Amino acid sequence: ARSFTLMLRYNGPPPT
Amino acid sequence: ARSFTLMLRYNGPPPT
Amino acid sequence: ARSFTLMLRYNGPPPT
Amino acid sequence: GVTEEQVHHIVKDALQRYSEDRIGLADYALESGGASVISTRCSETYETKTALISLFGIPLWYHSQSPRVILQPDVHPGNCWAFQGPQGFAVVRLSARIRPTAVTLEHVPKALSPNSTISSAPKDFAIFGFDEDLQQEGTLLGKFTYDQDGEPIQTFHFQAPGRGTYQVVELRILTNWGHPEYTCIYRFRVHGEPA
Amino acid sequence: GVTEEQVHHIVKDALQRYSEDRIGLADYALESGGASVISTRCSETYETKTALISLFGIPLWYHSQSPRVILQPDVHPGNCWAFQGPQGFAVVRLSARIRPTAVTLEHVPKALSPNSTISSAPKDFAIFGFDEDLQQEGTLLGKFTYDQDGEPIQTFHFQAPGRGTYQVVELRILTNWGHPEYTCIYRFRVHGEPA
Amino acid sequence: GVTEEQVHHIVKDALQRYSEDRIGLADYALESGGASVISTRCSETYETKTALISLFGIPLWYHSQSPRVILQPDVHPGNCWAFQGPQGFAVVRLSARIRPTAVTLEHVPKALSPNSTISSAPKDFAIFGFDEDLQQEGTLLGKFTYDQDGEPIQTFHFQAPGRGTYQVVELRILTNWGHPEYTCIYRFRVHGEPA
Ligand SMILES: [K+]
Ligand SMILES: [K+]
Ligand SMILES: [K+]
Questions:
Q1: D124-130 and D88-106: which strand pairing?
Q2: Which domain holds residue F10?
């Protein structure tokens, strides 16, 4: 079956 | 939907 | 429940 | 000549720079720091159907690298995003709004490649900034050339940088080093001054 | 001065130490070696809702770093566990029962951080050992301070170590370096003598 | 003696070799470059049931390392494939058909192991090539010994290499360094000349 990827989007900075 | 994590627990040493 | 692994097989080279 | 203590200081400094993401500059395009691709605004991914993921021997789906991987530090051979042909582009929402001062591109070393050639590497490229996050018309920040005969990691300083700020940038690949099927991007970094 | 052969030996030794997890000490808190967090005995994770995981453009769930990541070697910016405020704690079942002799804490380098500041870093901290694995009252093994002006990786030797053994330890963060919202822990290591 | 400029050149060259997968040789067994295991032709994985994966506290499944991990670069303690006893084998489809010239095996350093011992390391081993991809009878390419007292990464050159090509190879472990339960393989590389 088809190809594939989880997508990640930020709308603000994560903790660093 | 909500946040998330697989949890890993050892009850003994893995091979190293 | 039982043990586990995704398997990866190539039949040709990926882009490098 | 040099003293033993001096040699140790030189080595210590060199390894500290090595450990600081090799180049010692903060990367506002690093995914784990908060950057992300705008997938609808990148080139279509080159899909090859040579990598098959399965379970218990039963077929499942094909494995391909998405544009996210250009924002990720692992750069072993094949840990790269590929698009078809020698022209392509990727749009990145940086982790913060910055005044860009430099970008960095890297490719796999020749020593780790068959025949010591890296023809899939990007060659001429251009960087655009999008003043308003949702605008579709970008401002040219700089044009550069990745040198296939240079060091694997190459940093490019905006020659006359014009201090406004941006959070959305585009990497536009204009040519590659001759691969007839695809171009491979291992990692793209953006450096600059925060607010 | 020094000879050429001597310089090569110095560099060889330095890179070998670099390759041995930088510090050349076995880490009984490393997750892949058999360590794990006791999640019900850690601080609540700081949940931010700024990182969204999706499929085909359809929203799914939020991405956050769990306490497991303090036992994992990747320490690029953001590959850290965060809790709310300047006080928090994590409880770890080590991979074996040991006599602890030192702990190591590291943070992202200033050079890779905006404004060259790391205010989310832990400052004062304490290490406790739980003689019986299930007991809730711990024994103080040592109190230390992570120096924001020091090297990114810092190792702390138990000043007068009192040789009994432990498999369950607690990292208790008492203060941070001034961040008003959270504290970030990149990686915690525990060193000592096995049975 | 040596000059300061000479010391800097030595360090620069050493770090460049370090960055080129430590040894500066292309690896046709690297999974990300296109290599893969033939799972039905490897030894059964040593299953231990000590690592439990769960969700919200509810048990799910056991975690074990598959033969794929011998083709992956992370070699922190426990990032290794284990089989039962001191004899085992793995079959790999290389990323391209090559004339093999060398193989590389590595193990975790003694410094990162309890008691500074690595008894689970492979000792005597042999490499076979399968001229036709689907044939079951292999040709001996070389026999070597991984030295537990040597450097963690060891490269072995085929002493009198007999130039035909292969894409399917077998790593056959004949003995280990004394571990009574299992043998652990951290990473296996194959080097040679492409067509
Ligand atoms: K990458
Ligand atoms: K980490
Ligand atoms: K591995």
A1: unpaired
A2: 1-195
Q: How far apart are CA F44 and CA E188, in angstroms?
A: 34
B13 inside 8 A of chain F by CB: yes
CB contact under 8 A, F109 and E19: yes
Q: Which residues of F touch D6 (CB under 8 A)?
A: 4, 7
State which amino acid sits at residue F83: F
Closest by CA to E62, choosing from F182, D134, A9, D24, is A9
Residue D139 CA to residue D148 CA, distance in Å, equals: 27
Across the interface, of F59, F62, F68, the residue whose CB is closest to C8 is: F68
- Non-local (6+) Cβ contacts of E163 within 8 A are E99
Residue D6 phi/psi, 5° resolution?
-65, -40
Q: What is the total count of domains within chain D?
A: 1
b/e string for E101-128 if b means 16 or more Cβ within 10 A?
ebbbbbbbbbbbbbeeebbbbbbebbbb
Inter-axis angle of helices D4-19 and F4-19, to 10 degrees?
40
Interchain touch E–B (≥3 Cβ pairs closer than 8 Å): yes
**F20, F32, F34 member nearest D111 (Cβ):** F20
Helices and strands, counts by H and E, chain C = 0, 1
Please list, in sequence order, all residues whose beta carbon lies within 8 angstroms of the beta carbon of residue E101, skipping any fewer than 6 positions away.
E157, E158, E161, E191, E192, E193
Question: Which residue, D137, E51, E11, E123, is CA-closest to F2?
Answer: E11
* Ligand with the closest atom to the CA of E78: 2
CA distance D174 to D145: 10
Residues of C in contact with D51 (CB under 8 A): 8-10, 14
Resolution of the structure in the document, Å: 1.5
Do the beta carbons of residue D160 and residue D100 sit within 8 Å? no
Tokens found for residue D130: 């999008």
Instruction: Record the tokens describing residue F174, joined without a space.
Output: 């004949």
Chain B residues with CB under 8 Å of E33 CB are 13-14, 16
| C-alpha–C-alpha distance, residues F90 and F17, integer Å | 29
Q: How was this structure determined?
A: X-ray
